[PDB]
Every structure is written in C-alpha cells, then in structure tokens.
Symmetry: C2
Subunit: 150 residues, 2 copies
C-alpha cells in the first residue's frame, strides 16, 4: 500500500554516514548524519520517522539492519512492517544512486554556509523537498497521504 512505503538509504561523505528515508511514491526524504550505521541509530531514526508520517512499510537498506534485533524492536514498536530492500525492480537502485549524488551535490553547494555537516544535510533535505519538478516532493507526499485518508 503505496502511501505508507519508505526506503532506507545510507550514504557516506566526509568520513560520516548520512541515513536517509525516502518516501518512495513522492521522493520526499528525511535524513540525519550519524557517526556510523548501527542497529541502535537506525532504530531510533525509524522511531522518529514513524512518529512524523504514517510509515507502514520500510525497505531496509542492507541485511545487517534487516537482521538487527534493535531495528526489529523499533519496527514492532512503531507498527512498521520491516521488508528487505532488494530491487526486484532494477531501476530502483539507479533512482537511489541518483538521489545520493543529487543530495551530495546540494551539500557541496551549501557546504560553506554550514559549519557542521549536519546543518548542510538538513539544508539539502529542505532544498530537495521543496524543489519543484509542477509539484514538489513535500507537496506530493501530503497529496498522496491526504488522498489515502479520504
């Protein structure tokens, strides 16, 4: 069920890890910088995400988080069906790779306005979610979920 499906994506920059959740139907994202991708960090990130949007399904980004006791506990807590993230559809991989490159591009564009990477990454989530493509991802996610409520 499309309005509730999200994909986790973990990318690296400046020796740090950027954890992203993409709402697959809209391209809307939330993202955080963490020191490393552990079960505990992923779990807490999912808890935050599910408190903010109606997360029904998550495609986890790798098998360590799919396996992780802590990730499973957060998904049980927040009512999330944890799935694998295998691109049975191959164009999925490319879409995510392209967002990572686009996100890193926006990060380079603001990187000097931000003393800390975390700032630059939240600036990048803002520019990504507001970019008009004519609707933005922030507009599409709202539209998709509102249609689903009604």
């Amino acid at each position: 069920s499309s309005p509730g499906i999200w994909q986790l994506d973990c990318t690296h920059l400046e020796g740090k890890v950027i954890l992203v959740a993409v709402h697959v139907a809209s391209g809307y994202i939330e993202a955080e910088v963490i020191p490393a991708e552990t079960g505990q960090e992923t779990a807490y990130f999912l808890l935050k995400l599910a408190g903010r949007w109606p997360v029904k399904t998550v495609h986890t980004d790798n098998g360590s988080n799919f396996t992780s006791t802590t990730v499973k506990a957060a998904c049980w807590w927040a009512g999330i069906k944890q799935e694998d993230g295998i691109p049975y559809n191959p164009q999925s991989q490319g879409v995510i790779e392209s967002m990572n490159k686009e996100l890193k591009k926006i990060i380079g564009q603001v990187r000097d306005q931000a003393e800390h990477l975390k700032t630059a990454v939240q600036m990048a989530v803002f520019i990504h979610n507001h970019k008009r493509k004519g609707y933005s991802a922030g507009e599409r996610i709202v539209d998709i979920i509102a249609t689903d409520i009604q």
Copy 2:
C-alpha cells in the same frame, strides 16, 4: 492557517525538550537538547522547515526571538519569525496541557527506553497518532493538502 507553528520548550530530568506544535492540528515534532540555545533552536527549525511547509513560527521566548542564529535560520528557511505572546490567553493553557500530556506519556514509556530521547520520540509518536475522530497526524496532512489544492 496551514503554515503556523508554535515553539514550546519544557524541562524533564534536568534536560530540555524543544517542541514545535502545528497550531491548527496539534501535530508536533520534538527533540531533547542539553540546553535551549539559539544554535539548537536554529537547527531544530531548519529541520522542521525541510519537513513541513513552515511559514510562520511563534518563538517560545524573547531570547530565541532575539537570537541572531535563530533569525539566520528563519531567513534561510523562508520562515517569518513572530513573538509567541498569547494575545489569546487560552493559547498558553493549551501549551501547558500538552507539556503535561507529553510528560505523562513519557512516564508511561519509561520502562521501555534507556535514554530520554527515545521516550520523547515514543511520546511524539503516541501524541501524533492519538485519535480525538481524527489524529493530529491526519489533521495536519488534511489541512496542508486543502491548502495545496
């Protein structure tokens, strides 16, 4: 108005919980920080505005209203920074009640969370999903979609 949010700062366990409340829906986002500083408040608003279409923020106190760093984040993110004076007195009573509701929920999830920050996000989840028959999560999405269309 679909773009109006209120900042709210409450204390528990010697730590600070910063809350943004979407006024029309009651939907919230919240974070634990060591201390309410301009830099923390700025970063929190930047995150909030990248996630929801934040047009106006009622700041929670005059230090954040004044803060250069808060004004810079509001300029960067396109937010009109306002004072949070309850020109309607029922506004402050609504925030007090939510801080008490939030603290209650945090109490109820204390067996389950080792760190306060986990309990606070559990409390955000339960607050936003609570049916009152729509939830706050439902109302904000409905409000903002009506706005877009």
